[PDB]
UniProtKB/Swiss-Prot annotation:
Subunit structure: Tetramer of two alpha and two beta subunits.
Top-level taxon of the source organism: Bacteria
Segment of the intact protein contained: 1 to 41 of 341
Subcellular location: Cytoplasm
Organism field: Mycobacterium tuberculosis (strain ATCC 25618 / H37Rv)
Family note: Belongs to the class-II aminoacyl-tRNA synthetase family. Phe-tRNA synthetase alpha subunit type 1 subfamily.
UniProt protein name: Phenylalanine--tRNA ligase alpha subunit
Length: 41
RNA sequence: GGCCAGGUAGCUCAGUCGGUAUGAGCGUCCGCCUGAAAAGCGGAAGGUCGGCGGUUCGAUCCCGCCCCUGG
């Protein structure tokens, strides 16, 4: 699960959803899913 | 003077001498529910753990000065 290849796939969907965040409210949700305490990272 | 105890979520406070503060109660949001609510049940959001530095792959947790609280 640690695999740096699978690790890179996590930062991919993060920055992708971050770049696809159009509003500040969507970002706060995106930050929760990709940077919060329950995020895969 | 030099040593102590404290600073932690919106409020009142626990807790940790390195990888989750599974933080609590209340406060906020969603669902079931109701004409609409609340409780109840179920699901979530939110803290840069007092500031600035030092070490470490990584410090609320280990080192130094200071901000301010009763000692």
């Amino acid at each position: 699960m640690l695999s740096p290849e699978a690790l890179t796939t996590a930062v991919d969907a993060a920055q992708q959803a971050i770049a696809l965040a159009d509003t500040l409210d969507v970002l706060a949700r995106v930050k929760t899913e990709h940077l919060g305490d329950r995020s895969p990272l």
